[PDB]
Ligand binder design. Structure first.
Ligand SMILES: [Mg+2]
Ligand SMILES: [Mg+2]
Ligand SMILES: [Mg+2]
Ligand SMILES: [Mg+2]
Ligand SMILES: [Mg+2]
Ligand SMILES: [Mg+2]
Ligand SMILES: [Mg+2]
Ligand SMILES: [Mg+2]
Ligand SMILES: [Mg+2]
Ligand SMILES: [Mg+2]
Ligand SMILES: [Mg+2]
Ligand SMILES: [Mg+2]
Ligand SMILES: [Mg+2]
Ligand SMILES: [Mg+2]
Ligand SMILES: [Mg+2]
Ligand SMILES: [Mg+2]
Ligand SMILES: [Mg+2]
Ligand SMILES: [Mg+2]
Ligand SMILES: [Mg+2]
Ligand SMILES: [Mg+2]
Ligand SMILES: [Mg+2]
Ligand SMILES: [Mg+2]
Ligand SMILES: [Mg+2]
Ligand SMILES: [Mg+2]
Ligand SMILES: [Mg+2]
Ligand SMILES: [Mg+2]
Ligand SMILES: [Mg+2]
Ligand SMILES: [Mg+2]
Ligand SMILES: [Mg+2]
Ligand SMILES: [Mg+2]
Ligand SMILES: [Mg+2]
Ligand SMILES: [Mg+2]
Ligand SMILES: [Mg+2]
Ligand SMILES: [Mg+2]
Ligand SMILES: [Mg+2]
Ligand SMILES: [Mg+2]
Ligand SMILES: [Mg+2]
Ligand SMILES: [Mg+2]
Ligand SMILES: [Mg+2]
Ligand SMILES: [Mg+2]
Ligand SMILES: [Mg+2]
Ligand SMILES: [Mg+2]
Ligand SMILES: [Mg+2]
Ligand SMILES: [Mg+2]
Ligand SMILES: [Mg+2]
Ligand SMILES: [Mg+2]
Ligand SMILES: [Mg+2]
Ligand SMILES: [Mg+2]
Ligand SMILES: [Mg+2]
Ligand SMILES: [Mg+2]
Ligand SMILES: [Mg+2]
Ligand SMILES: [Mg+2]
Ligand SMILES: [Mg+2]
Ligand SMILES: [Mg+2]
Ligand SMILES: [Mg+2]
Ligand SMILES: [Mg+2]
Ligand SMILES: [Mg+2]
Ligand SMILES: [Mg+2]
Ligand SMILES: [Mg+2]
Ligand SMILES: [Mg+2]
Ligand SMILES: [Mg+2]
Ligand SMILES: [Mg+2]
Ligand SMILES: [Mg+2]
Ligand SMILES: [Mg+2]
Ligand SMILES: [Mg+2]
Ligand SMILES: [Mg+2]
Ligand SMILES: [Mg+2]
Ligand SMILES: [Mg+2]
Ligand SMILES: [Mg+2]
Ligand SMILES: [Mg+2]
Ligand SMILES: [Mg+2]
Ligand SMILES: [Mg+2]
Ligand SMILES: [Mg+2]
Ligand SMILES: [Mg+2]
Ligand SMILES: [Mg+2]
Ligand SMILES: [Mg+2]
Ligand SMILES: [Mg+2]
Ligand SMILES: [Mg+2]
Ligand SMILES: [Mg+2]
Ligand SMILES: [Mg+2]
Ligand SMILES: [Mg+2]
Ligand SMILES: [Mg+2]
Ligand SMILES: [Mg+2]
Ligand SMILES: [Mg+2]
Ligand SMILES: [Mg+2]
Ligand SMILES: [Mg+2]
Ligand SMILES: [Mg+2]
Ligand SMILES: [Mg+2]
Ligand SMILES: [Mg+2]
Ligand SMILES: [Mg+2]
Ligand SMILES: [Mg+2]
Ligand SMILES: [Mg+2]
Ligand SMILES: [Mg+2]
Ligand SMILES: [Mg+2]
Ligand SMILES: [Mg+2]
Ligand SMILES: [Mg+2]
Ligand SMILES: [Mg+2]
Ligand SMILES: [Mg+2]
Ligand SMILES: [Mg+2]
Ligand SMILES: [Mg+2]
Ligand SMILES: [Mg+2]
Ligand SMILES: [Mg+2]
Ligand SMILES: [Mg+2]
Ligand SMILES: [Mg+2]
Ligand SMILES: [Mg+2]
Ligand SMILES: [Mg+2]
Ligand SMILES: [Mg+2]
Ligand SMILES: [Mg+2]
Ligand SMILES: [Mg+2]
Ligand SMILES: [Mg+2]
Ligand SMILES: [Mg+2]
Ligand SMILES: [Mg+2]
Ligand SMILES: [Mg+2]
Ligand SMILES: [Mg+2]
Ligand SMILES: [Mg+2]
Ligand SMILES: [Mg+2]
Ligand SMILES: [Mg+2]
Ligand SMILES: [Mg+2]
Ligand SMILES: [Mg+2]
Ligand SMILES: [Mg+2]
Ligand SMILES: [Mg+2]
Ligand SMILES: [Mg+2]
Ligand SMILES: [Mg+2]
Ligand SMILES: [Mg+2]
Ligand SMILES: [Mg+2]
Ligand SMILES: [Mg+2]
Ligand SMILES: [Mg+2]
Ligand SMILES: [Mg+2]
Ligand SMILES: [Mg+2]
Ligand SMILES: [Mg+2]
Ligand SMILES: [Mg+2]
Ligand SMILES: [Mg+2]
Ligand SMILES: [Mg+2]
Ligand SMILES: [Mg+2]
Ligand SMILES: [Mg+2]
Ligand SMILES: [Mg+2]
Ligand SMILES: [Mg+2]
Ligand SMILES: [Mg+2]
Ligand SMILES: [Mg+2]
Ligand SMILES: [Mg+2]
Ligand SMILES: [Mg+2]
Ligand SMILES: [Mg+2]
Ligand SMILES: [Mg+2]
Ligand SMILES: [Mg+2]
Ligand SMILES: [Mg+2]
Ligand SMILES: [Mg+2]
Ligand SMILES: [Mg+2]
Ligand SMILES: [Mg+2]
Ligand SMILES: [Mg+2]
Ligand SMILES: [Mg+2]
Ligand SMILES: [Mg+2]
Ligand SMILES: [Mg+2]
Ligand SMILES: [Mg+2]
Ligand SMILES: [Mg+2]
Ligand SMILES: [Mg+2]
Ligand SMILES: [Mg+2]
Ligand SMILES: [Mg+2]
Ligand SMILES: [Mg+2]
Ligand SMILES: [Mg+2]
Ligand SMILES: [Mg+2]
Ligand SMILES: [Mg+2]
Ligand SMILES: [Mg+2]
Ligand SMILES: [Mg+2]
Ligand SMILES: [Mg+2]
Ligand SMILES: [Mg+2]
Ligand SMILES: [Mg+2]
Ligand SMILES: [Mg+2]
Ligand SMILES: [Mg+2]
Ligand SMILES: [Mg+2]
Ligand SMILES: [Mg+2]
Ligand SMILES: [Mg+2]
Ligand SMILES: [Mg+2]
Ligand SMILES: [Mg+2]
Ligand SMILES: [Mg+2]
Ligand SMILES: [Mg+2]
Ligand SMILES: [Mg+2]
Ligand SMILES: [Mg+2]
Ligand SMILES: [Mg+2]
Ligand SMILES: [Mg+2]
Ligand SMILES: [Mg+2]
Ligand SMILES: [Mg+2]
Ligand SMILES: [Mg+2]
Ligand SMILES: [Mg+2]
Ligand SMILES: [Mg+2]
Ligand SMILES: [Mg+2]
Ligand SMILES: [Mg+2]
Ligand SMILES: [Mg+2]
Ligand SMILES: [Mg+2]
Ligand SMILES: [Mg+2]
Ligand SMILES: [Mg+2]
Ligand SMILES: [Mg+2]
Ligand SMILES: [Mg+2]
Ligand SMILES: [Mg+2]
Ligand SMILES: [Mg+2]
Ligand SMILES: [Mg+2]
Ligand SMILES: [Mg+2]
Ligand SMILES: [Mg+2]
Ligand SMILES: [Mg+2]
Ligand SMILES: [Mg+2]
Lengths: 110, 59, 77, 203, 141
RNA sequence: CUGACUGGGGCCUGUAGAGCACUGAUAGGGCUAGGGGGCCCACCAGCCUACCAAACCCUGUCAAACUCCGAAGGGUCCCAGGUGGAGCCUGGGAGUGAGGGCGCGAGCGAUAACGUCCGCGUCCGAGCGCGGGAACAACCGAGACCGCCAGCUAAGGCCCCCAAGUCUGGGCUAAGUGGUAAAGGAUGUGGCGCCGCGAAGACAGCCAGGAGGUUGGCUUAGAAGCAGCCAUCCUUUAAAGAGUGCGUAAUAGCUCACUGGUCGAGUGGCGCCGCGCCGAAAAUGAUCGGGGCUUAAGCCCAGCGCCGAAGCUGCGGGUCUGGG
RNA sequence: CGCCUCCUAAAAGGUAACGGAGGCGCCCAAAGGUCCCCUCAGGCGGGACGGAAAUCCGCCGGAGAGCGCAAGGGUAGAAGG
RNA sequence: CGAUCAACGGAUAAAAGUUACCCCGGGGAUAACAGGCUGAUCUCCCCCGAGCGUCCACAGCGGCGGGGAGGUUUGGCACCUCGAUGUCGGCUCGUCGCAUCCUGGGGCUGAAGAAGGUCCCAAGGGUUGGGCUGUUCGCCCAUUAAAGCGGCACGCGAGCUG
RNA sequence: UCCCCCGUGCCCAUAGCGGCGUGGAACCACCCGUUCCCAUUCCGAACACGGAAGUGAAACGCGCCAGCGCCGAUGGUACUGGGCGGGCGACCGCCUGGGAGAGUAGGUCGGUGCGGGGGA
C-alpha cells in the first residue's frame, strides 16, 4: 500500500531515468538538504554535497543555494557537466529550487 | 574412435527429416557402411536414424 | 436451420520479432504486442500501439524483473 | 499396539522392475536423512491395514538399524487402485503432527429415530510428542440428534496432546436417511432447462 | 434429475476420454463405493435410475452419496436432417467418467445391504464396475 | 559452403498433464442474512425449524471460449559438423490450382459412414512394377539401367497344396476355441491367494433335538418368524433368529439356521490371474484361402536352423555426372 | 458475404467447416498536447431529513474499480480522477 | 468533396420473372431409382428385478435404467453407373431365410377335462374364395388345420399388363 | 576493514500480514509558528516557508515469534519427443531419452552495491 509521497517519488524519478541523464537527486529534511549525482547504469553515486557535511549556517533557503554552488564546484572537477534534476517528491520551489539555481550558477548544465 | 554405420532398414515411409539424416551421413543404399568420426553432430544424426541403422565403435 | 455465428477476424501476427542475442539495426521491430507484455528498456522505443523497436544498432537482451514486468534491451555493439 | 516391517535400501533399480518383482518402492526422510527404500508389498499391506497413518511402524533396515516412523504419504495407482509408493517419516524426540483415530462411543438418538451417523472425520490432526501416542480419542455421540453435530472443539484431549486444526471444524453429524416415500416428490419435482451466462451486450 | 442450474456456455465440444481418472479415485464419505472400470459419458437419466434403485433397496435407512455430476451438455441434430446448418441442440447432460472414479458411496447400512444396492445400481450403468470398501489407503489420501 | 538434418548455447511460447488462486459449474457438511412453516402476539418483539436457501469455512469435484502452475516439444539467432540432383541470385519454359487412403491431434456428426473439415506426417497419385497379406492403389517388406540355370537377407513363412522344421525345451486349451460380437450368466479347467469351520471331531450320509416368555408390536380387514417400518429384548439351555425357506384365509405342518449320537479327514464362502462355455437368428452351396490339424499343423514363453523380393552380394555390359 | 475480439488452433507465425460466442459501419474541441497535483471497487463501524443506494468521518482493502462503445490484452511506479 | 460501389478487390451511368412448349454443350465432379457404406430411426432378442398377479419378484407380466442382433422402415453419406442401371401395383413363374401361421415333437402353466397362455425343437409340405380401392397395406363378407412374416436390383417390363 | 543512522539502487514476498520488544547524542520524524515564498474546488490535513521548547506517542529503522501469507526438496506418478506392440472400438501396453502439477519433508519475520554522517 503506497502513499502519495511514495507514488509522487516514483512518478518523477521514473521519467528522469528514461532520459538517461546523470541524476542530481535532492533530499530535503526538516533541518538539512542533501544532494548526490548518480549514474543509474552502475547503481553508483559519483559526487555528493550536503549541508550537514559542509556544516552550514542558518537560513535553509540560502543554505540550499550554497550546498548547490558546492555540488557543482566538486562536480565540474570530475568532468560532469550535463545532468538532470531529480525533484523527488519535492515541488520545484523554495529550498529545492534554491539548490538547483546554486548548481546552475556553479555551471552544472540543466 | 570412429563410427561404422550400416543402413539395414529402409527409410521409405519415415519422415523426411529422418531421410535427411541419412543424407548427412552420406547413406544412400541399404547394407551400405560408412565410417565416420565420432563427434556429437555426427552422433546426433546416427541416434536419430538408429531404428534404421546398426552401429559399431571402431579403431 | 441456420447459424447466428459464422464470423472471426483477420489474425494480427503478433509476438516477439527479434530474440535475445540477435543483432539488430536502429529501427528494427523487436516485439509486436497488445499492451505492455514487454516494456521498453535501454535503447528501446515504444510506439503508439505498444510496438517495441530498437533505437540503436546492436544486440537484443531480455530481462525478467519480477513484479516490474519483462523488459527488452538493445546493447550497443 | 506396535508394528514392525522389514525395509531394504534401493539404488538405481527401476520402480517398474521392483513392483513387478513384488516389492513396493518408497522413500525415507526427516530433517537429517533422505533414503531410497523398498519394502515387500505383500508384507507391508498386512501391516498397513492395521497400522495406517495412526500407529508407529518401525523399519528393520538390513544395515542393522531400526527406525521409528509414521507412514506419511501413500500414492495409489488410480486405474488399478494399488499402492505404488510410500513415504516413511522417521520420528525423533521433537513433537510431530499426525492423525489420531476417533472412536464415536455411544449410539446417537438421531440414529434411533431413523438417522445415520455421518462420520466426517474418523481421525483428527494433532501435534504431540512421539512418546505420547494415544490409541484413539473417545467421543460422546450418544446425545446427537437429527441433525445435531460435534466439533473439533468438543474433542476431549488425552494428556500432552494439542489440537492442530481449527475447533470450528465439524467432525460428525446425524442426518436423515434415504426414504422411498421421498420418491413421490423427487420424481414429481420439476426441473427446468439451463440458463446461459451471457456474452456481449449481455454478461 | 441432475443438471447445471446455469452455465457460461450452452454447447460444449466433445473432447476425449483417454486415461484414468484425474481424481475422485478414493472413498471419501461413505462405507462402501461403486467405481467405474471403463470410460464413458454417464447420463443424468442413468445416475437417477441408479440412485433411485439404491434408495429403493434401503427403503427406510442409509445415506447415498453421488460423487459424479452431469455438467457436460449433450448435443443432437434434429431427426432426418443433413450435415451442416450449425451445431445440434442440447438434449441432455452427461458425466464424463474415467476408469477409477468412485461414482456412488453408501453409509449407515449392513455390508450385505450395501453390496446389493451397489450391485443393483451397477446394472443400471453403461459400464463395468467394481465394488470397494473403505481401506486405510482411502483414509490416507 | 552459405543447404536439408545434426551438436552446443541463449531467447520466445501457454498445449499435454494438472490445479481451483480468478470466471463459472458443483455433491455433502458446518456456520448463517433472507424468506416459507409451526407456537405467541398487533403493543412490536420473540422462540422452534428432518423447509427452500446468499455470503463465508470444510470435505470433494468439473470446464474449448477458467489458470496459482505447467511439461515433452516447437520456432528463431550465434558458433560448429554437414560437398548435397544441397543452397543463393538473374533470367527462359512450364504444369498444377477435383486429390485420396492410412497414423496421430481437434471441430462437425451419433465416443455413426469407404462421412465431412482443418493440423503434422506418410504412402498412392506418378511406384495398378517386385515379395508378404488367399484374392486387393495407398497395411507390412522394398525405391525396378540391362543380362546370368550364382550367393545373403527383408516382411512373411517352413504338415500337403507351396520354397524351407511334421525343429528343440516349459506351460495352457478340448471349445475345431483357434477360424470375427456385448452387457450379463455358469460347480469348465488350470493357477495363485483370503477368511472361517474341523481330530477341544467338522463337512456328506445315516440319527434324534429345533424350546419358554409370545397368536409379541408403532399395526390395519387374518398378521401366531414368514402383508409395511421406527422392535430385538430375556429364558431352559447341550442347543435353536421374538426366524433362512416351502405352507396358510390366518394357523398348523416340513425345514434351515443351531446342539447332541454315528463314523474318522478334511470341509465351506470371498476374491484375483491364464485359457475356454453360454449369450450367437437372414435370405443361391458350403468352406479357417483348401485339404486337413487336438502332448497341434491351436494359444503363451525361450531358442537353433532353413526358405523367402526386381532390397544387398558376386560376374559382365550400357549411359550420364565427377576425379584421374 | 466487408471489418474487430475470443475459442476451435495441436505452448513460434499461420490454419477449415452452413463449428461455438459476441461486436463495428461510430465517437471526442476534449474524451486532444503538456505541466502540476490526486487514487479505486468493496466490507465493517459511526451520522438530521436519508432510503440497499446521495453526502460526511474512521478502520480494513494490490486492484476484484476505472479506462465512451464488443472482447481480449494492458494498466494505480497510470493508460484512471 | 460526391460510394450500405454492404455481392464490402468495387463487370454497366443504367436491369425483374417464367418455361410441363423447349434446346445445345457438359457432369455420376451433383440430386432424384436401385445398389454400397452407416444403423440414428425401425424390427427382433437379451441384462437388472422396482412392481402387478388374493397369497407368491420371474403362470403371464417388467417401472427407472443397461447390452446387442438383423439390414424388411424413415434417414445420413455421395462410392460404380447421367456416350441411359426403365421406374409403384398387378399377372406369370418361382426360389430362399426362419425371428413358425398351420400340421409334427416337447418343457412350464394361475395345466381337472376340453380348450387356451407362454417358451423350446422343427423350413417337409401346406398356407382359400370374394366386396372396396391404382393400390402394396388395411378394413370387411364367407370359410379355414392355417389363412405366417421377410430376402432375391422394395426377385421377375430383351416375360405380359400399364 | 566493523557497528548505527540518512540517502539512492539492485534482487523482486526467503523481502509480506499480525504480535511483542527496542532506538532520539547524531541523523530522520513528528513537533513550534504561519511574518515571508508558496498553498487549500473548505482546512498550513497536503504542499510550502521561518524555526528548534518538547517527543520517539504516530511514522521510520533495528530485533524477536512460524498464526496467516510467501518459498519448497528427495521420491513416485501424469504427460511426452523418437522407436515398437495390442484392441471392433472407446481405448491400452513395452523400449529409449525428457519430466511435471498436487502433496510430503522442510525453508522464511530478508540479502546485497554505491555515496554521505557518526562511533571504535
Ligand atoms: Mg548494482
Ligand atoms: Mg521400413
Ligand atoms: Mg513401410
Ligand atoms: Mg521424426
Ligand atoms: Mg537400396
Ligand atoms: Mg532408399
Ligand atoms: Mg429454426
Ligand atoms: Mg442465422
Ligand atoms: Mg463460426
Ligand atoms: Mg480464420
Ligand atoms: Mg488470418
Ligand atoms: Mg483470430
Ligand atoms: Mg511473444
Ligand atoms: Mg508515441
Ligand atoms: Mg496512443
Ligand atoms: Mg539474460
Ligand atoms: Mg541489458
Ligand atoms: Mg456494448
Ligand atoms: Mg468431435
Ligand atoms: Mg451416449
Ligand atoms: Mg453429442
Ligand atoms: Mg424448433
Ligand atoms: Mg453441424
Ligand atoms: Mg449435434
Ligand atoms: Mg441425453
Ligand atoms: Mg472421472
Ligand atoms: Mg452394467
Ligand atoms: Mg486431495
Ligand atoms: Mg560448411
Ligand atoms: Mg544458416
Ligand atoms: Mg541452417
Ligand atoms: Mg539444432
Ligand atoms: Mg486437459
Ligand atoms: Mg474455481
Ligand atoms: Mg485447497
Ligand atoms: Mg478436460
Ligand atoms: Mg484454450
Ligand atoms: Mg486448458
Ligand atoms: Mg523449451
Ligand atoms: Mg504449434
Ligand atoms: Mg531446434
Ligand atoms: Mg533452441
Ligand atoms: Mg558451418
Ligand atoms: Mg532433387
Ligand atoms: Mg530440386
Ligand atoms: Mg553443385
Ligand atoms: Mg518451351
Ligand atoms: Mg497457369
Ligand atoms: Mg490445375
Ligand atoms: Mg474436391
Ligand atoms: Mg480445391
Ligand atoms: Mg485436403
Ligand atoms: Mg497432400
Ligand atoms: Mg482401399
Ligand atoms: Mg497405434
Ligand atoms: Mg483422428
Ligand atoms: Mg478444431
Ligand atoms: Mg450407439
Ligand atoms: Mg474422405
Ligand atoms: Mg474415419
Ligand atoms: Mg473421423
Ligand atoms: Mg494426407
Ligand atoms: Mg491425375
Ligand atoms: Mg509402394
Ligand atoms: Mg513417391
Ligand atoms: Mg502368395
Ligand atoms: Mg502387393
Ligand atoms: Mg499379393
Ligand atoms: Mg503397390
Ligand atoms: Mg535405382
Ligand atoms: Mg551368360
Ligand atoms: Mg539363407
Ligand atoms: Mg522374420
Ligand atoms: Mg499359410
Ligand atoms: Mg515342401
Ligand atoms: Mg513337433
Ligand atoms: Mg458351440
Ligand atoms: Mg474352427
Ligand atoms: Mg466357428
Ligand atoms: Mg463375465
Ligand atoms: Mg466358472
Ligand atoms: Mg477362471
Ligand atoms: Mg413351528
Ligand atoms: Mg458363443
Ligand atoms: Mg510343447
Ligand atoms: Mg531371394
Ligand atoms: Mg538394384
Ligand atoms: Mg559392375
Ligand atoms: Mg468495407
Ligand atoms: Mg491460434
Ligand atoms: Mg492458440
Ligand atoms: Mg498459435
Ligand atoms: Mg510471419
Ligand atoms: Mg451481425
Ligand atoms: Mg479538461
Ligand atoms: Mg486521455
Ligand atoms: Mg489538461
Ligand atoms: Mg468506501
Ligand atoms: Mg456506512
Ligand atoms: Mg436515518
Ligand atoms: Mg447512507
Ligand atoms: Mg479492470
Ligand atoms: Mg461517384
Ligand atoms: Mg449486414
Ligand atoms: Mg463480389
Ligand atoms: Mg455489384
Ligand atoms: Mg481482404
Ligand atoms: Mg462501375
Ligand atoms: Mg454514377
Ligand atoms: Mg446489379
Ligand atoms: Mg430469360
Ligand atoms: Mg424443363
Ligand atoms: Mg404448362
Ligand atoms: Mg398442361
Ligand atoms: Mg397432366
Ligand atoms: Mg404445346
Ligand atoms: Mg410444340
Ligand atoms: Mg424450341
Ligand atoms: Mg442434352
Ligand atoms: Mg459419385
Ligand atoms: Mg464441386
Ligand atoms: Mg443419383
Ligand atoms: Mg439411394
Ligand atoms: Mg448398382
Ligand atoms: Mg446393429
Ligand atoms: Mg450393424
Ligand atoms: Mg440377444
Ligand atoms: Mg431375472
Ligand atoms: Mg403385491
Ligand atoms: Mg408364485
Ligand atoms: Mg413385493
Ligand atoms: Mg424375463
Ligand atoms: Mg422398459
Ligand atoms: Mg444401446
Ligand atoms: Mg436398442
Ligand atoms: Mg439392405
Ligand atoms: Mg434395404
Ligand atoms: Mg438416403
Ligand atoms: Mg438406404
Ligand atoms: Mg452419389
Ligand atoms: Mg446420388
Ligand atoms: Mg467427398
Ligand atoms: Mg444416370
Ligand atoms: Mg451405348
Ligand atoms: Mg455403355
Ligand atoms: Mg444406351
Ligand atoms: Mg443399356
Ligand atoms: Mg427356431
Ligand atoms: Mg401342437
Ligand atoms: Mg390340455
Ligand atoms: Mg378346467
Ligand atoms: Mg405348450
Ligand atoms: Mg426347453
Ligand atoms: Mg416348412
Ligand atoms: Mg424348401
Ligand atoms: Mg414358406
Ligand atoms: Mg368386382
Ligand atoms: Mg379387388
Ligand atoms: Mg386392396
Ligand atoms: Mg373397382
Ligand atoms: Mg390404404
Ligand atoms: Mg388351433
Ligand atoms: Mg385373404
Ligand atoms: Mg416369397
Ligand atoms: Mg422384398
Ligand atoms: Mg422391383
Ligand atoms: Mg419389376
Ligand atoms: Mg414393356
Ligand atoms: Mg413393371
Ligand atoms: Mg432391358
Ligand atoms: Mg435386360
Ligand atoms: Mg410372359
Ligand atoms: Mg398410364
Ligand atoms: Mg535507508
Ligand atoms: Mg538498501
Ligand atoms: Mg511487521
Ligand atoms: Mg521507547
Ligand atoms: Mg517500531
Ligand atoms: Mg532529538
Ligand atoms: Mg532526550
Ligand atoms: Mg520551536
Ligand atoms: Mg499571510
Ligand atoms: Mg518577514
Ligand atoms: Mg503545519
Ligand atoms: Mg514508536
Ligand atoms: Mg516518510
Ligand atoms: Mg525461526
Ligand atoms: Mg513460484
Ligand atoms: Mg510443491
Ligand atoms: Mg521429480
Ligand atoms: Mg509415441
Ligand atoms: Mg502410457
Ligand atoms: Mg517412459
Ligand atoms: Mg528416464
Ligand atoms: Mg506439467
Ligand atoms: Mg514439484
Ligand atoms: Mg517472513
Ligand atoms: Mg553501506
Ligand atoms: Mg561511513
Amino acid at each position: 500500500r503506497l502513499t502519495a509521497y511514495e507514488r509522487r517519488k516514483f512518478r518523477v524519478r521514473n521519467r528522469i531515468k528514461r532520459t538517461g541523464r546523470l541524476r542530481l537527486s535532492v533530499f530535503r529534511s526538516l533541518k538539512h538538504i542533501y544532494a548526490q549525482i548518480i549514474d543509474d547504469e552502475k547503481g553508483v553515486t559519483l559526487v555528493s554535497a550536503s549541508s550537514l557535511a559542509l556544516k552550514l549556517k542558518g537560513n535553509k533557503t540560502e543554505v540550499a543555494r550554497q550546498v548547490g554552488r558546492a555540488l557543482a564546484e566538486k562536480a565540474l572537477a570530475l568532468g560532469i557537466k550535463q545532468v538532470a534534476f531529480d525533484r523527488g517528491p519535492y515541488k520545484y520551489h523554495g529550498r529545492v529550487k534554491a539548490l538547483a539555481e546554486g548548481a546552475r550558477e556553479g555551471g552544472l548544465e540543466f | 574412435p570412429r563410427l561404422k554405420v550400416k543402413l539395414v532398414k529402409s527409410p521409405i515411409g519415415y519422415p523426411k527429416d529422418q531421410k535427411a539424416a541419412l543424407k548427412a551421413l552420406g547413406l544412400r543404399r541399404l547394407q551400405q557402411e560408412r565410417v565416420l568420426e565420432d563427434t556429437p553432430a555426427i552422433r546426433g544424426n546416427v541416434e536419430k536414424v538408429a531404428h534404421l541403422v546398426r552401429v559399431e565403435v571402431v579403431e | 436451420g441456420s447459424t447466428r455465428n459464422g464470423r472471426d477476424s483477420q489474425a494480427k501476427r503478433l509476438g516477439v520479432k527479434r530474440y535475445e542475442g540477435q543483432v539488430v539495426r536502429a529501427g528494427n521491430i523487436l516485439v509486436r504486442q497488445r499492451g505492455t507484455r514487454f516494456k521498453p528498456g535501454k535503447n528501446v522505443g515504444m510506439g503508439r500501439d505498444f510496438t517495441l523497436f530498437a533505437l540503436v544498432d546492436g544486440v537484443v537482451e531480455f530481462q525478467d524483473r519480477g513484479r516490474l514486468g519483462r523488459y527488452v534491451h538493445v546493447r550497443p555493439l | 499396539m506396535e508394528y514392525r516391517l522389514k525395509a531394504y535400501y534401493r539404488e538405481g533399480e527401476k520402480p517398474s522392475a521392483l513392483r513387478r518383482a513384488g516389492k513396493l518402492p518408497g522413500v525415507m526422510y526427516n530433517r537429517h536423512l533422505n533414503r531410497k527404500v523398498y519394502v515387500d508389498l505383500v508384507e507391508f499391506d498386512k501391516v498397513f491395514r492395521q497400522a495406517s497413518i495412526h500407529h508407529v511402524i518401525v523399519l528393520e533396515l538390513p544395515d542393522g538399524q531400526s527406525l521409528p516412523t509414521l507412514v506419511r504419504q501413500v500414492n495409489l495407482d488410480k486405474r488399478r487402485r494399488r499402492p505404488e509408493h510410500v513415504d516413511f517419516f522417521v520420528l525423533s524426540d521433537e513433537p510431530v503432527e499426525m492423525y489420531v483415530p476417533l472412536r464415536f462411543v455411544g449410539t446417537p438418538a438421531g440414529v434411533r429415530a431413523g438417522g445415520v451417523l455421518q462420520e466426517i472425520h474418523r481421525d483428527i490432526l494433532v501435534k504431540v510428542s512421539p512418546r505420547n501416542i494415544p490409541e484413539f480419542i473417545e467421543v460422546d455421540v450418544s446425545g446427537l440428534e437429527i441433525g445435531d453435530s460435534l466439533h473439533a472443539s468438543d474433542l476431549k484431549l488425552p494428556p500432552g496432546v494439542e489440537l492442530a486444526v481449527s475447533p470450528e471444524e465439524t467432525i460428525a453429524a446425524v442426518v436423515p436417511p434415504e426414504d422411498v416415500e421421498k420418491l413421490a416428490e423427487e420424481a414429481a419435482a420439476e426441473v427446468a432447462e439451463p440458463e446461459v451466462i451471457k456474452k456481449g451486450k449481455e454478461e | 434429475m441432475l443438471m447445471p442450474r446455469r452455465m457460461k456456455y450452452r454447447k460444449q465440444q466433445r473432447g476425449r476420454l483417454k486415461g484414468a481418472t484425474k481424481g475422485g479415485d478414493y472413498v471419501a464419505f461413505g462405507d462402501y463405493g461403486l467405481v467405474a472400470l471403463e470410460p464413458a459419458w454417464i447420463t443424468a437419466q442413468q445416475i437417477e435410475a441408479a440412485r433411485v434403485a439404491m434408495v429403493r433397496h434401503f427403503r427406510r435407512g442409509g445415506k447415498i452419496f453421488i460423487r459424479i455430476f452431469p455438467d457436460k451438455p449433450y448435443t443432437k441434430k434434429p431427426l432426418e436432417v443433413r450435415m451442416g446448418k450449425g451445431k445440434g441442440n442440447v438434449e441432455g447432460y452427461v458425466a464424463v467418467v474415467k476408469p477409477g472414479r468412485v461414482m456412488f458411496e453408501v453409509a449407515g447400512v449392513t455390508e450385505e445391504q450395501a453390496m446389493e444396492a451397489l450391485r443393483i445400481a451397477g446394472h443400471k450403468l453403461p459400464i463395468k464396475t467394481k465394488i470397494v470398501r473403505r481401506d486405510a489407503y482411502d483414509e490416507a489420501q
